[PDB]
Amino acid sequence: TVSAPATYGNFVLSPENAVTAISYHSILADFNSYKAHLTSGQPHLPNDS
Amino acid sequence: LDKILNVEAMHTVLRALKNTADAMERGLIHSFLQTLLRKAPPYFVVQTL
């Protein structure tokens, strides 16, 4: 009896992503997370979205 | 990202309506000036009369 997932995942866009999608035609996942990690100097991310 | 376009369409409609109303006022001004320029004899004519 495999315990397979029951539902599709979902990947909402960030309100910060809406700006770089318009001015730069580009989206770097979790733009709010990279700002905090570069502020904190921490090199590693727990997960890549 | 979609609400941005939903609002931008509304703003484009408002702009295309305000500018057309203003063009209408300026065209009314223009036409009332065109009317006088067709009913306005030159200076020397009126002076001779």
Curated annotation (Swiss-Prot), chain B:
Designated name of the protein: Major capsid protein
Domain of life: Viruses
Main function: Self-assembles to form an icosahedral capsid with a T=16 symmetry, about 200 nm in diameter, and consisting of 150 hexons and 12 pentons (total of 162 capsomers). Hexons form the edges and faces of the capsid and are each composed of six MCP molecules. In contrast, one penton is found at each of the 12 vertices. Eleven of the pentons are MCP pentamers, while the last vertex is occupied by the portal complex.
Species for this entry: Human cytomegalovirus (strain AD169)
Complex formation: Homomultimer. Makes the hexons and eleven out of twelve pentons. Interacts with triplex proteins 1/TRX1 and 2/TRX2; adjacent capsomers are linked together in groups of three by triplexes, heterotrimeric complexes composed of one molecule of TRX1 and two molecules of TRX2. Interacts with scaffold protein; this interaction allows efficient MCP transport to the host nucleus. Interacts with capsid vertex component 2/CVC2. Interacts with the small capsomere-interacting protein/SCP.
Family: Belongs to the herpesviridae major capsid protein family.
Subcellular location: Virion; Host nucleus
